[PDB]
């Protein structure tokens, strides 16, 4: 049984208890914290690609009203985000299991852009998700895993200064 764990869940939970926010820019902004995943139970000799996408956790637009995030009343369906390929992909199971898989180079944007960057909708709430894709072998296989601890709202600037302070304290 293939096992997926969040590295530094301690710290993600402090962000989650405040409602986490991630900046999006036209050119794209790297994440803090960085999603880092512990993986065991891969075939060390099998080939795999690690993919990252962002599920829209609800269908609403959120707004920071009198020190509190509150959802809009007008849900619209949210099309899936594009997928980010971990740049170590494709690689042997041994490679992925020798250290936490760190998505340090993904950039979050608000604008449809050349390559790499993932476009999110500002003021929507997102739940990061990975796919582990067994490649090159005969039988293709996908294992997916969500990380509720890593939920955030996409923002063009921070609203809750408690988030601002935590971001700086721990970076
Ligand atoms: O063949 C690829 C791929 C890659 F793994 C790295 C660069 C470009 C690619 F199309 N993948 C299999 C499904 C998910 C990623």
Curated annotation (Swiss-Prot):
DNA-binding region, residue range(s): 11-171
Subcellular location: Nucleus
Signal peptide: none
Reported tissue expression: Detected in testis, but not in other, normal tissues. Detected in lung tumors (at protein level).
Entry superkingdom: Eukaryota
Consequence when changing residue 116 to C: In NTD; uncertain significance
Illness the protein is tied to: Neural tube defects: Congenital malformations of the central nervous system and adjacent structures related to defective neural tube closure during the first trimester of pregnancy. Failure of neural tube closure can occur at any level of the embryonic axis. Common NTD forms include anencephaly, myelomeningocele and spina bifida, which result from the failure of fusion in the cranial and spinal region of the neural tube. NTDs have a multifactorial etiology encompassing both genetic and environmental components. Chordoma: Rare, clinically malignant tumors derived from notochordal remnants. They occur along the length of the spinal axis, predominantly in the sphenooccipital, vertebral and sacrococcygeal regions. They are characterized by slow growth, local destruction of bone, extension into adjacent soft tissues and rarely, distant metastatic spread.
Main function: Involved in the transcriptional regulation of genes required for mesoderm formation and differentiation. Binds to a palindromic T site 5'-TTCACACCTAGGTGTGAA-3' DNA sequence and activates gene transcription when bound to such a site.
Subunit and interaction comment: Monomer.
Record protein name field: T-box transcription factor T
Organism: Homo sapiens
Lineage of origin: Eukaryota, Metazoa, Chordata, Craniata, Vertebrata
Encoding gene per record: TBXT
Complete-protein stretch covered: 41 to 211 of 435
